[PDB]
Every structure is written in structure tokens, then in C-alpha cells.
Design brief:
Helix content is about 30%, strand content about 30%. It has about 280 residues and is α+β, with helices and mostly antiparallel strands. InterPro entries: Arylamine_N-AcTrfase (IPR001447), Papain-like_cys_pep_sf (IPR038765).
């Protein structure tokens, strides 16, 4: 009997270990209530950072390397590491799903490349967007509809279908303006439902991890989201966000960055990577 493709490498995942890490318990049946608990736990516990790209211009996307780094060391990953792991979980639990790519705009009108991986789940007559690896990610799957305002704890999102790019049919996911303190919306990304696979993510990750035209290749970007709070380290600038109110920012010294990475984000590098990171931080 010919061997299957094993597309998302579900079988290589340490299923019980992953679920314990994300604080998942109970019914594992491939349903919406399970998906809701999976996404909330993943977004809250899997750490988000790009330090492998900043230090080595390379990120391993294979399931054994990803689950060992994300679940067994004080480390995080960026979108493609998160989607590899979540994709593997969705596959093991028997969900009907597919991968997609989004263009991260953050308000810009100039079209950006499609370098943000996400997953879409099919449940009965509906489709659910699982944007699990954005850093300040939605804490719950989002019902794919042509237009909606969605509350996600203290965060607010807007989903709107349209001609996102010329001749395309897609959606824009927006975040409430001024970290939720103002009326209006800030576009986050645009996406189309064209199916994408782990091979596309490897080709996209190669550009994201090493290209000088990729912002995540040279400078530290670390993120964490909670129901009523968020933190973003933008190189040496620490952003502390209070959804519905706004944010404050403070510059950290190279030593304070290592301290903040451990105390706030639970991230600690090896002796040599710590030394190399301080060099990237003290640069220019």
C-alpha cells in the first residue's frame, strides 16, 4: 500500500505534551468548542519571537525541531512555526482544514507580499479563520463572513470581504484603532482562501528570515497577548498595551532586554546566543 503525503506531519507531533502545554483538557472531538479551546490555549501559551532569524537568518519549520523549541525550551516562534504546530494538531484531532497566506499591511495601501501564514477550518456549513501565529493574535477562531465586528475579550476586530488587491476576492482583518481607544479601524492583513501548504511556508519563511526587505530578518520582535493586555518588544523598545486605553513605550539597555525577555516573556537564550543578541542590540 503506497505511503501517504503526511502533509502537516500530524504523526510526528507529541499530542499529549502539546495539549498539556497549552492547558487543553476534555473532549478532543473535531468540533468548534474544541477549536475554540485549542486556539485560546495556543495563543496564550506558545511564545512569539523571531530571535532565530535575527541571530542566524534561518528558522527550522520541521515538527520535531519546532515542538522541541516551543514546548521544551524557554523559547517562542514566529507565524510559520506556530502554523506548523497548529496545523499538526488540527491534523491529529481530525479537523477538515487548509492553510492560507496573508499580506501584513498594518494600515499601508502599498501591497505587501503574502508572508503571514494562517489556517482555515471547515465545520458544517461554515468556515473559521484560525490566525494563531500573529503575536497579538485573535484569542478565538473567527467566523468567515463577508463583514463583521468581532469582540475578542478586550480586543476588537473587523472582518470585511472585498477586492483587497486588484482582481482578487479576499478579506481584510482590521484591529480597533488606537489599541481600541478610538473609533475606526487599522488594517492588519488581507488574505485570500487559495490553499497553501508547508512547502509554501518554507519558501515564504526563507524570505522572511533572511531577506533585507523583511523587517523580521534583522531586528528583534517579541510579542505576548492576554485577554486584557499585551506586550511587544520592538528591537530595544518595550511597548506595554492596555486594550481600550492605549500604550506606553520605554527603551531598554542591552542587559534590560535579556532581563525583560526572561521576566516578561519567559524567553532565555543559550550562553552564546545571549552574547550574540547583546551584539545585535548594541549595534550602530
Amino acid at each position: 500500500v503506497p505511503r501517504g503525503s503526511h502533509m502537516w506531519n500530524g504523526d510526528e507531533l507529541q499530542l499529549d505534551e502539546y495539549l498539556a502545554f497549552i492547558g487543553f483538557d476534555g473532549d478532543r472531538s473535531p468540533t468548534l468548542e474544541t477549536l475554540r479551546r485549542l486556539q485560546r490555549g495556543h495563543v496564550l501559551n506558545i511564545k512569539w519571537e523571531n530571535l532565530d532569524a535575527v541571530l542566524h537568518k534561518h528558522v527550522a519549520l520541521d515538527i520535531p525541531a519546532v515542538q522541541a523549541k516551543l514546548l521544551r525550551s524557554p523559547r517562542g516562534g514566529y507565524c510559520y512555526e506556530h502554523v506548523a504546530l497548529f496545523g499538526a494538531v488540527l491534523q491529529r484531532l481530525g479537523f477538515d482544514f487548509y492553510g492560507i497566506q496573508g499580506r501584513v499591511q498594518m494600515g499601508a495601501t502599498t501591497i505587501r507580499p503574502a508572508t503571514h501564514g494562517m489556517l482555515v477550518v471547515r465545520l458544517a456549513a461554515e468556515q473559521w479563520l484560525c490566525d494563531v501565529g500573529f503575536g497579538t493574535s485573535p484569542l478565538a477562531p473567527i467566523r468567515l463572513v463577508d463583514e463583521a465586528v468581532v469582540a475578542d475579550e478586550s480586543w476588537t476586530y473587523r472582518l470585511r470581504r472585498g477586492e483587497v488587491t486588484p482582481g482578487a476576492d479576499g478579506w481584510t482583518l482590521s484591529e480597533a484603532a488606537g489599541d481600541g481607544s478610538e473609533p475606526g479601524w487599522l488594517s492588519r492583513h488581507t488574505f485570500v482562501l487559495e490553499p497553501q501548504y508547508p512547502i509554501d511556508y518554507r519558501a515564504a519563511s526563507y524570505f522572511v528570515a533572511s531577506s533585507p526587505h523583511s523587517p523580521f530578518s534583522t531586528r528583534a520582535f517579541v510579542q505576548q497577548i492576554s485577554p486584557d493586555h499585551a506586550y511587544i518588544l520592538d528591537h530595544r523598545e518595550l511597548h506595554e498595551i492596555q486594550p481600550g486605553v492605549g500604550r506606553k513605550t520605554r527603551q531598554l539597555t542591552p542587559a534590560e532586554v535579556l532581563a525583560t525577555l526572561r521576566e516578561i516573556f519567559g524567553i532565555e537564550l543559550g550562553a552564546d546566543d545571549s552574547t550574540l543578541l547583546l551584539e545585535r542590540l548594541a549595534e550602530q
